[PDB]
Symmetry: D2
């Protein structure tokens, strides 16, 4: 039984002034609010019960957008992070939400895509012990937590935004944890940067030999909407896929309906209000087309 | 003395579900909120006193983003449009704001760009009588108010969203009016579509021989953020200009400063809070570079 | 042992006038000539011996570009298609090249991408019987060979460019064949459309119960560079992947090297002449980085 | 009467390996060969007699593409530049083509666009003395000839690819010359970079107080297809304009027709062969639509 968390706060600065207008996680990536992406990521890892964290000012807005999740077969809840003091805070704010369950954390501005993605998630959701994260080759490792491998391919060290990255593998923003995480996070101290760093959390598991690091191959897409350029590219990336396939990426209604969290009647009923536009039309069409 | 209006309402359905979390006019075009564009359009027509109209729920968010305009040497005010019942409603809603002055209306999801644009504006701002609009050759005239010319090149008729457009010239979303507009708009009746149509307003002036229709040539760009694709193209269009020139489009602080609505000290001060990101850096650089 | 064919002729009227002077398959997708893509596809299916077919005027060009393939561990050969009379003609023109081997055909303007793409290719290249093709869900099935499935998910019909597609699954431009293909192609007659249609070849296998149709899921990317727009989208799609990952797509040197068809010293030598620019620099970097 | 030159050689290494296969000036920018762009620029400056320079191997291909120009009312000629030894060589290779006339040089991978661009060209093309060039604010002045102004906005120095640019204004690749240029070019000596530099030409005119430097404002688009990314951006830029307006950029047939260098019947005849695709359809449509 795994609970999930979407960390969808932050200040947004790289994007000023676009995001003085709205939290980054409410902006669209092509055709739908950014947060739908990571939401669909948890959903495809089979997690139905999820906690959305954001700023004090934006939390109501996410609530207004997503409601309690029942319409999608989900159980959504909300909490505020008073200040963007680090990804690890997720576990402190989310302590009572998690209780004694397995958990998973995804960053609100991270967008995943690829064939068999859901089998990659599945394998991590199902380890009931230790922690799991994913390594992805990128151009600018210095912008992330970087993971170093020995010649045998084993992970041996982790560094957060190193001036001299030891490899080009970044740890992406998707993390699976067992019941140690809360206590690990309680005992962290701010880093030099002054954050409670998820990298320290991951280092703790590593130092116990309990961190599993799976490679996410060049074949998947792992984009982040951190900068005006990357936001734009992810936008074009999605549009290209959607207009070629006639299938839509990270549309929660669809995923719900394919996982059987809602039935045909429910989907029909999600469609109606949205029927005048292409999104609703797409939802309806799913009721009459078999998609492998 | 011309007052201006930005009609930034609408239900924004073609963009669902992207616009469920919020109003189209708050989304970014590349690097700044959409409404900056039209705002900078009025600003370049030399208009400093401006009414912003939006839905009741979005109104407060515009305010939050633009304040009263004093920091940019503007005088901004706000009004609500309870429902999107037609672009002509702007003149009803805006009646008291206008008083007895000349006025100008720009749609909040309209984006203009081009050499000598501001001379084009100037020439219309300065007619003190009649109305002025602009015609632009487009691919899909049927989506707009279309204007027909006789072989002499004179405008002779206007139709809104005609099934059989009589030409490929659309009237864009930028309108200049003298003091007859409020009364013209008070005597309108909803069209078959059920809107109080700016096209009817324009026809009234045309039937009196007082509508001026200038061509906005192929050289200018007139883009609309109406659909997910066009929104995306507008974003890429701006980013291309900005990254080639190192100059920014529709950055109100800059415009204010160049028009002398604020001085160097003010601009420095606007920069500070935005200094950690590129936008601030750009503002600062304007204090030490001469840009012709 | 399977032999491969890249059909890289056509007239490309859809790209006129861009292709008046030269063949579609020599224009770039972002950073490399188009034909590198499908070449890399055959290479990842483990095919090293390949026949490239083009128009009489462009074949020399391809020769000048790719040479005999030795530098990349390949064995490239060339043949002319005097007129674009159908994709099946690949099997006539290529008869003697094929001899008595298994073969594969890939269209020169098709571009694939995705995780585990190389396992999908492997499975098909190893059948030693019948034929294999791939179905991909697309927006405009009417532009391709379309395959209908029964409720059991079993392929039951195929039509080329139907006005009323029976499904949204298009057969893509990648085909694997056993030793029956040449005789099937010999007995074809021109279609109403005036072509010797691969779709008829595929139907012939289907009629004997020997056509295997695997789904290529929404997780993979299948783009076609047929139109100005799609060619442009394909270019942006590749750049996004390449600028995020720091890895390059369909770079034959790399693939050769990773398959061990050339060694480090050969790669090194392929890099030198290209060292002044990014592509060579990339080839070098591969000698000193481990990429999972 | 001014004669024009398009310098369309180079090795375009920055584009390898895409340009191993085709000169950079033959690759498409969206929907037409790159060279159509600068060709159209000279055409808009009223120049009908034009010399196209390229590498020994690509010249033939340009010939094949453009012919002698008679079909478009132009008089095209060709010459080879044995090696890319500097833009100024244009004037040595073009000496006899030039004779005793005014001349103009445009770089083959330069693309201009903007309202009143044709008036800007006209002004310069009509000076009958001295030289005229254009300064355009850009992000990376260090990659071009850079021009410095004094506080009175008067040009006072020019440097080619300076490590420490004295301003952000690049001299673009469009140059107008009186009868002094050939002699100025004959006395140049190779620069440290080993090129006969047009910047030296321009400086020679500056030292004599006869170089006119006009600003090309942020309102115009000045793009260069020098890198894979910039090529891609230019493509997306043109497509956005073309799909919004239903007009095409730099289509020589149209330009020829609008300038009356060919008549309706000729245009009709250029369209036939191209009638099956959009580009011919567009040429036809111009015979029945008035475009302001
Ligand atoms: C640091 C942090 C990030 N987040 C979220 C926001 C982002 O989606 C994601 C990563 O944020 P970042 O990528 O670290 O960037 P940021 O949102 O802090 O703003 P900036 O670009 O100015 O650096 O995690 C939180 O929710 N709380 C936090 O304390
Ligand atoms: C009609 C209308 C438009 N607008 C704004 C919204 C748009 O920016 C612009 C044009 O509106 P439209 O784009 O014509 O329609 P819309 O904005 O409701 O969007 P959609 O049709 O997809 O639902 O003017 C108002 O602010 N109030 C209005 O009554
Ligand atoms: C006429 C024409 C222009 N262009 C380009 C040239 C210019 O960069 C740009 C602008 O045309 P210009 O005539 O320079 O400017 P414009 O057409 O907007 O101005 P107006 O309508 O008031 O006369 O379009 C073409 O690409 N093809 C053409 O046929
Ligand atoms: C029909 C045909 C195609 N081809 C290649 C060309 C393409 O890469 C691919 C598909 O061709 P098409 O995509 O069918 O397009 P085309 O190249 O025939 O030209 P047009 O756009 O004007 O229709 O197959 C051949 O090599 N020989 C042929 O006879
Ligand atoms: C290896 C390699 C693959 N590709 C392509 C082939 C595929 O479409 C795609 C993905 O490679 P695949 O090997 O299909 O998938 P992957 O690399 O993610 O698999 P793995 O988990 O084992 O690491 O990238 C290249 O373009 N160049 C290459 O060198
Ligand atoms: C099923 C589904 C997938 N996705 C995303 C998740 C995946 O990253 C990506 C790929 O779909 P997957 O089902 O993960 O892979 P696939 O569908 O290609 O595999 P197959 O077709 O053979 O079953 O698409 C959605 O966005 N929405 C959906 O409804
Ligand atoms: C230097 C030179 C350029 N050209 C053309 C090519 C270009 O369009 C334009 C400018 O060339 P450049 O942009 O200076 O560079 P290049 O084209 O040689 O390519 P690269 O730098 O990547 O190797 O001038 C010539 O035709 N002859 C020349 O001698
Ligand atoms: C001055 C300025 C203009 N713009 C916009 C308005 C116009 O659409 C476009 C061009 O402005 P204009 O000043 O009209 O065009 P220009 O600068 O090319 O004219 P010139 O140099 O000959 O004086 O750029 C901004 O976006 N920000 C600004 O600060």
């Amino acid at each position: 039984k795994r609970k999930g968390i979407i960390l969808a706060g932050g200040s947004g600065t790289r994007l000023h002034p676009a995001t003085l207008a709205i939290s980054k996680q409410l902006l669209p990536v092509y055709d739908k609010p950014m947060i739908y992406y990571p939401l669909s990521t948890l959903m495809l890892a089979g997690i139905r019960e999820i906690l959305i964290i954001s700023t004090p000012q934006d939390t109501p807005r996410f609530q207004q957008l997503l409601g309690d999740g029942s319409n999608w077969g989900l159980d959504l809840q909300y909490a505020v992070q008073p200040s963007p003091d680090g990804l690890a805070q997720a576990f402190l704010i989310g302590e009572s939400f998690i209780g004694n369950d397995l958990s998973a954390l995804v960053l609100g501005d991270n967008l995943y895509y690829g064939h068999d993605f859901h089998e990659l998630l599945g394998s991590a959701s199902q380890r009931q012990t230790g922690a799991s994260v994913f390594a992805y080759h990128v151009l600018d490792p210095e912008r992330y937590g970087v993971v170093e491998f020995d010649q045998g391919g084993k992970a041996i060290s982790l560094e957060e935004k190193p001036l001299e990255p030891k490899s080009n593998y970044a740890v992406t923003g998707l993390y699976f944890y067992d019941q140690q995480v809360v206590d690990i996070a309680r005992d962290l101290k701010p880093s030099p940067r002054g954050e409670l760093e998820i990298t320290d959390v991951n280092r703790a598991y590593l130092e116990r030999g309990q961190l599993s690091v799976e490679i996410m191959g060049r074949g998947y897409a792992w984009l982040d909407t951190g900068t005006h350029d990357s936001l734009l590219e992810a936008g074009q990336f999605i549009a290209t896929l959607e207009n070629r396939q006639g299938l839509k990426v990270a549309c929660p209604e669809e995923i719900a309906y394919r996982q059987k969290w809602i039935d045909a009647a429910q989907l029909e009923k999600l469609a109606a209000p949205l029927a005048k536009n292409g999104y609703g039309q797409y939802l309806k069409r799913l009721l009459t087309e078999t998609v492998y």
